[PDB]
Symmetry: D2
Subunit: 106 residues, 4 copies
């Protein structure tokens, strides 16, 4: 799929987690973020369109995705453990990653 709406998927579901009442809602939302993050692994962003995929800045662009994927993995465990406020915070802390990569590659 596209990076935007891979990014939209991530962003919508992030708010869903923010407004959630319950675990079920969070589990479903995190799973959707997992799909969009993994599916975004391929993409070449607009800033980086001519740079080589095997390029030092593509390597750093993807790394940020490993970070995100790892942070979503763990938050899903917390959700699965029905530690909701805890999943919710891990999601909030997961924001930096979004931010660090935005500042640099967008």
């Amino acid at each position: 799929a596209d990076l935007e709406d891979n990014m939209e998927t991530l962003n919508d579901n992030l708010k869903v987690i923010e407004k959630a009442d319950n675990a079920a809602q969070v589990k479903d939302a995190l799973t959707k973020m997992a799909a969009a993050a993994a599916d975004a692994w391929s993409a070449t962003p607009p800033k980086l369109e001519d740079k080589s995929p095997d390029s030092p800045e593509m390597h750093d662009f993807r790394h940020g995705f490993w970070i995100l994927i790892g942070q979503i993995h763990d938050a899903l465990h917390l959700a699965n453990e029905c530690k909701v406020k805890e999943a919710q915070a891990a999601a909030e802390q997961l924001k930096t990653t979004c931010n660090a990569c935005h500042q640099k590659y967008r």
Copy 2:
């Protein structure tokens, strides 16, 4: 790509790493494995086509990939650190992950 290809991608580069003389070959190989593992995230394996995408086996199916992704991530760091032998061992260790998921959903 096809679940099948991705598995072939992982497999093939696994041997490339087992065989490698220097860092560059290991890095390139790992990176390919990363692409295949991430791309495979959304696949529904043949043994589970009946069972829903939100089902318990599917979550456990997907979890296994989270583990692979994390292990590839770290090995690439070791490769980047020119610690080749160590990278090659981290690869060999991974094989368990491949095998835990094969025993179960294969």
Copy 3:
């Protein structure tokens, strides 16, 4: 050592990364953060002394430490890859972890 003293160690070093010129200052600093973070895995914080180690809340208190350990582990790879500004950024992010646990347990 002391929980207080480890916190100090984490902080002091955190700043040393902030004012870094080179990777070596960063690697050394992170390695110490690692020692402090691991060494504090044990500690019972003041607000929790009445609570059993095996309490749901000393399970979350410790969880936070795993997050920090993981984050440092990864920043050290970045540093070891002489990816210095990048390592610096990973350090900036991991503050969230310091703050999530402060707001709750401190």
Copy 4:
């Protein structure tokens, strides 16, 4: 404890996981492994008695503990999710880590 005592803690708890019947015994055991792994972080092995604890040779010895800590954190998540067989498998796999570090530093 001294490296030896933590290694025994690790070893003993691993059989306990091995023979377990219910989640509770697995979690209690993994939590102990966590303490022993974190508490070992600082130990110098004996074949490194001389080598300064900023050698890259120390750095590599500890790296292995970052790997163990991470694999324990997870297997605890699995256990906390009452996914007991899955937790048990995650412990068996994580030995490779035990085995790798024994081979090199022991």
